[PDB]
Amino acid sequence: PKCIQCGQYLDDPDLKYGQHPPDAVDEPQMLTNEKALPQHKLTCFSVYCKHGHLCPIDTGLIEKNIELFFSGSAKPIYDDDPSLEGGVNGKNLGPINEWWITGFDGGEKALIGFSTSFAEYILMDPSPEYAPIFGLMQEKIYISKIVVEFLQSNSDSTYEDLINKIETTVPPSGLNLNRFTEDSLLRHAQFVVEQVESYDEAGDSDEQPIFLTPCMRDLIKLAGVTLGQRRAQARRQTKATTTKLVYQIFDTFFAEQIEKKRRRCGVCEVCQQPECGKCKACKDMVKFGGSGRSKQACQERRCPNMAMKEADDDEEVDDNIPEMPSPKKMQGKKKKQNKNRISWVGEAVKTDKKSYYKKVCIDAETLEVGDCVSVIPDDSSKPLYLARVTALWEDSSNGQMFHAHWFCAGTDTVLGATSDPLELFLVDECEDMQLSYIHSKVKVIYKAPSENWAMEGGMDPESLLEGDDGKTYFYQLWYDQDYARFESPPKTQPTEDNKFKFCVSCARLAEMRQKEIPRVLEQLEDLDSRVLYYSATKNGILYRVGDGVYLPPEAFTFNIRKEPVDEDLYPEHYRKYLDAPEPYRIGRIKEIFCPKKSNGRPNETDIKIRVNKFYRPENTHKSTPASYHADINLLYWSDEEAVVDFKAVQGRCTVEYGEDLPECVQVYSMGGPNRFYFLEAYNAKSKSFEDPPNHARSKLPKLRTLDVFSGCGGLSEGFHQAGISDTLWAIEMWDPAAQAFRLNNPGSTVFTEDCNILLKLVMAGETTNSRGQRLPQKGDVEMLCGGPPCQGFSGMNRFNSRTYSKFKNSLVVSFLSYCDYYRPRFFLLENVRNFVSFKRSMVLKLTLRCLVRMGYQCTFGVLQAGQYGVAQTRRRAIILAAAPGEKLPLFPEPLHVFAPRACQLSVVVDDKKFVSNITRLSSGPFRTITVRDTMSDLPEVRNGASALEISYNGEPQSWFQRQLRGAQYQPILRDHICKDMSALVAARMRHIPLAPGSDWRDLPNIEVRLSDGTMARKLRYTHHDRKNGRSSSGALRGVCSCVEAGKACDPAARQFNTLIPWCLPHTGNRHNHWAGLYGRLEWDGFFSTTVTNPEPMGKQGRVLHPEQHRVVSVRECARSQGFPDTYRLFGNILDKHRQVGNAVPPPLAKAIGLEIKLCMLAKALTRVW
């Protein structure tokens, strides 16, 4: 039941009609007014339709040609008194043609003007009847103005950034509101976005339009905003500091790579407008009257709907193709060449199949062992093959032979076309081949690092350019195509017996094949059916009888519909319609044996293991809840036994009876990896515990580290816990983060500056900044680490001219210059997972290329945070790099078991699948850290908690909490504070049930008094949705007119300040029913991502507390990041929330740091000959 004129509903919610004294209608402009078009003022005004409903003038009625009329008292134009005293009462004025904003007073009420066919009217004060309608329009205009000005200040701001801006914006006195809310924005989303759109349409360019800002795109999706229409209201109207080498790399890539589906919706008004003819695009058209070269669409015709989809495609990884099998050995046939004569030189160096090794041979050229040759493949896409002659011999069965150690072309590596076309890489591929297949002799230069490589940073590459090159092939690094690892060549030296035969590739492939074969070592005892053994080796690990052993969870087993829903009360409940594997089985080796075959000899092709089962607390009849308090390190002895294949073993661990230990369990557990302990045995049949049987008994200096983009220091904290690092310098432009870093690092020098500033000063010769802080110089920095934000270069679509310039001077380039200048021993670049996929993987490739050019060993990999002791699903791209003379670290094996869908660590670059050294595929020794492990001990607080220092009011309840609280006597609970969500949002949280899986779809449709004094009225369902149907009671489920086929959204169907957010059923069908929004965290679950600013309808996943009616606290977020409770944060609550969220979790950083410690130990304790 709506009006035929205005779209308003005749019955309800709060309609209103007009009231006149009454007096005259338009054309009586004679009383005082008579004295291009005339202009007057109009106070105590009211707008209405032909049926007399008070209508807003900003919902498109006028432009749909529905005649809106108005009344009020007219005044002389020079009058400033709004008081009626004073004026001539008019009626049925209009209909309204244009309406526009004449400006703002002070302030800041917008001053609107009308225009009839007769005169123009500048409005003053509205009639008491029309006051609320005019107040909303007043609210629309101001909010839209704030948004536009906000989006101009930053093109990267997210949805939660936008809300914060709105909430901190003081509403003008004209409106009797004392605060704006998220609801205020969603209320006027359509109008605001239209203003946002019209900002761009006026000012045409090539840069991204202001409405494609992330926060706007989410708003257009959350609220159901229709894009592409109207713009009438107007009345006219960070650059990288680089070294020469780094600059040259990205500059040359530009010059050599500069030049270059979806279509317009065709339905939006932008698409239905003719080509203007005033823009550069239309001026460059053959049809009157340009060249027609640009072929760009009309500047006033770019479809915003098409723009959104292109923005969506740009954020997508296209794609994670299933298989994508494993990279094949670079294989096929070669061309037998037709050389004239092949003769040996000198005579046989060695004699052995009667193989006679020679030293030199003639092909009209001369070849020695160590020379390099070219070989022609019979060719598919194949280029020339290059190899090093490692041996020359004449077989008495085969012909004249040589062994070829293959080089790999740079373009065939992960580097791709970014590689120097003449750079080669050593490779684990070699082959016996006949001399007849040699095409030619070839010169390959080994470009070793100079002996002062550590000091050549920043130098003009023209100075080191000498002499006369590059004209031929060269190499400097070994390459592993499975792991994309660039490493220094093996320094392995041949015996005097090996000299003219030695092949490093053959040697490495030999050691590889030996370790991968499970082999029995020492025999122990001989029995009739089997032979016992003392030891055995597998994957380079020595297993002896009595050792602890990892086994897959399937190695052995232990001895062990609601009532119906009131769909009127819960009208959105109908929209509600793999796990982490078990941690390793742990056993102690009782026997190593092989069955004897028919002949009586032991069969050592299958090695067996008799093992004593160990019970985790979860394996006990007590089941899962036993793990809640138990150490993650704890086991129970058992007298149960099992026989497994030695093939099944996954590694060796230490399982020690706790009492026998020479030290504390805490010290023991913290002493090294794979350390378990037990105190009691467990009897399954009696389901009880008892003392175990007595046959169950038995240095480096820290690296001086510079942390760029340090933040509050999550990454540095982890490295410090690893014992490998002392962060003496930190660079952080954002003051609160830098301040927090100082608090946790008293001995560090923190520069609250832009990273581009410092390096420029150091490269200028300065020793201190203006504040007098001693700058780090060459030799000081031993390790460089940093996690630069990706906002400058974070698209998946390929580079273009404009977008590359932004990357050309990005912080990645800045950070690489720090690495080039200081030349640290180790280098780590942390970033988001998609860093590896940005710009069709060009950001990664250019980063690796830059490191290789500098002479660094390097690799990359993706790590899941949850696999290292944290209740959170977040992946990170990690680029590792090591100086020449160092060992390139491996990526740490997962310590904790975790859901496999969150453990997709593989990487696709140019249709080449890349993988890290990680062998534990979602498997592991320790159980998953849950939300319960994370925060179950923290005392109850409320929405808007602000008490910075409180008491824990209890003892730690989990291993996780025990470790993070520390060993303090009476510790203070810091920053257990949370955001003061608005009245409406607070009421919504209170009505989200505690049952796991609960979200907004569980909200009741009821009237409740909000804490701001207002009433949240029930959501009214107004239309029938044939995609969802009616409820079982026969009620409508549609909420807008856009739910029917081909219908536009209906204004006045909009509802706000409701418990169930109107915008969620409005756009639910297009976005998986917004599953997760207003969702609670599960005790058994995890954080969906790094929370930086917790919003229920935000983009950071579920952020409601599992039980308490509030959003998660800063401490709780810090707990999810594995921060020690004693770690200090700085600033206001949002400053602290962002600090924690931006941080690399210390448990992850520590795991990485430990792999680095190994390399430090290797270089210090291992020497080569």
Ligand SMILES: Nc1ncnc2c1ncn2[C@@H]1O[C@H](CSCC[C@H](N)C(=O)O)[C@@H](O)[C@H]1O
């Ligand atoms: N141009 C610039 N110079 C120095 N720091 C910058 C910068 N631009 C951004 N940053 C800072 O770099 C940080 C990246 S997030 C910090 C990383 C995280 N705290 C960790 O533990 O590793 C942000 O806090 C940001 O303030």
Ligand SMILES: [Zn+2]
């Ligand atoms: Zn009407």
Ligand SMILES: [Zn+2]
């Ligand atoms: Zn369109």
Ligand SMILES: [Zn+2]
């Ligand atoms: Zn045009």
Ligand SMILES: [Zn+2]
């Ligand atoms: Zn070989």
Ligand SMILES: [Zn+2]
């Ligand atoms: Zn709609």
